[PDB]
Amino acid sequence: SNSITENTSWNKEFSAEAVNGVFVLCKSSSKSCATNDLARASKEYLPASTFKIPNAIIGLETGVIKNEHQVFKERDLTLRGAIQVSAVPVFQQIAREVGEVRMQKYLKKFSYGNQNISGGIDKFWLEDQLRISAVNQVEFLESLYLNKLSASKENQLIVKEALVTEAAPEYLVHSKTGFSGVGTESNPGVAWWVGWVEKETEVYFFAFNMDIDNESKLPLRKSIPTKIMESEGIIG
Amino acid sequence: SNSITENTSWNKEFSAEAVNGVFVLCKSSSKSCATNDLARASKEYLPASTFKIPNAIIGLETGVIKNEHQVFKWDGKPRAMKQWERDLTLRGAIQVSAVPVFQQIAREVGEVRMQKYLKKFSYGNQNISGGIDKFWLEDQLRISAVNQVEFLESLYLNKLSASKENQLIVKEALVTEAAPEYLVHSKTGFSGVGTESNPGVAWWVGWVEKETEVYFFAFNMDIDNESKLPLRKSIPTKIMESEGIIG
């Protein structure tokens, strides 16, 4: 069995910046998750570039992505290079070569959100038909961490290393940002930060999302979760 | 086939700190390497904890290390450093240089398998004599900075005689710095202080993966005082910063 609890110890991190959002933090050894908002933790949002995680695994499994050091046979762009920069055309052509049938098959195997890829093969992760919750993101990342997705162990290891974003002697942070855009005041955009931390022998999975109606607030997608995980003694 | 070229453009990074040492830097591949000291670049030295890289690969390929998520449990007995007195992951044991974890891996691998893999890996003089749990710390095993680059390039390319999975597990365990522009994979080593006339050796070896290019590096220096240990990272870091590789 696994569990989730709602806490209030992190509410001060959101209200100080007037941010509507959710953080989900799961400790692997205890199979326990904590969140500031159970309803928003289960609410499905378009994934935007957090979709580069399953798209990279599917691209490698289908053979569309050549290897860790060269996406396609920029010409010498590495998989990590494509995940960091926007690389809009790169993941568009990966999705096109994968195709709707195989993309649908793998998102069902991965239990990835509502699995609705309607709206166009090269932009459905932005069309707002495909949606995934913060809880679903941490479940998906735990499966990737354990090499339990329906993909080769090698391809899961390649994507795990490509997602490293911070390294310290005591921990490794794997993460991915996403941003749908600013939307409007009545219908704001969504900004994500999802990932996990390998800290000594413990592993912490996390997923953050927030309403955003101004790119001015974009830095908060990393600063709020960073402050929570620093207060928990996980990073920093 | 491979060429080693000696330049003087990094000599001030060494003379400013009164350090006798060598830096080897290769862009893309080991086909062309640059160094401050052609003779020292190929001179073989005790690997010390840089040996944890092949030892980890061999531990995984022999099954002594069961898998990626292996935890090395602390039995509660005294260890030489307090940071080793705890359960450790493979990355944890590598990052804190937990000698006793790797001594037990070496004992379980055994002399016959250890010799076989160092021959497959072309790992320096491949001399493992003197004690299965200390040959890389105080005996006759020797490897040069150029050989370290060649070995790390093979690992980067998944060309060592080991599964691709096991090479990927060790490569992720070696990550030491991450930035949007690059990942640094690296390992330090320090044989000990020796004496003023017969100093020890300190190492920093690794590689830097950028968006479209890779750089392999190996540094070693004479050291007779622990106060000089920080130079094993500061000299090569200053060189790679001046080359626009990191920072």
Residue numbers in the entry:
A (entry chain B): 19 to 91, 103 to 265
B (entry chain A): 19 to 265
What does the paper say about this structure?
Natural and laboratory-selected variants of OXA-10 have been identified, many of which differ in the spectrum of β-lactams that they hydrolyze. Class D β-lactamases share the same general structure with conserved motifs, including an active-site serine 67, a carbamylated lysine (K70), and a stabilizing and invariant tryptophan residue (W154) within the Ω-loop. Both protein structures contained two chains in the asymmetric unit, corresponding to a dimer, as previously described for OXA-10 (14, 24).
OXA-14 crystallized as a heterodimer in which, much like OXA-10, only one of the two K70 residues was carbamylated. In chain A of OXA-14, the Ω-loop was closer to the active site, and the indole group from tryptophan 154 (W154) interacted with the carbamylated lysine 70 (K70) (3.2 Å), as was described in OXA-10 (14). The interaction between W154 and K70 is critical for both the activity and the stability of OXA-10 (25). In chain B of OXA-14, K70 was decarbamylated, causing an open confirmation, consistent with what was observed for the heterodimeric structure of OXA-10 (14). The Ω-loop conformation was maintained, and the hydrogen bond between the indole group of W154 and K70 was present. We observed an increase in nitrocefin hydrolysis for OXA-14 as the pH value increased, suggesting that K70 was more stably carbamylated at a higher pH. Compared to strains expressing the pPSV37 vector control, the expression of OXA-14 resulted in a 16-fold increase in the ceftazidime MIC and an 8-fold increase in the ceftazidime-avibactam MIC in PAO1 and a 16-fold increase in the MICs of both antibiotics in PA14, consistent with previous reports.
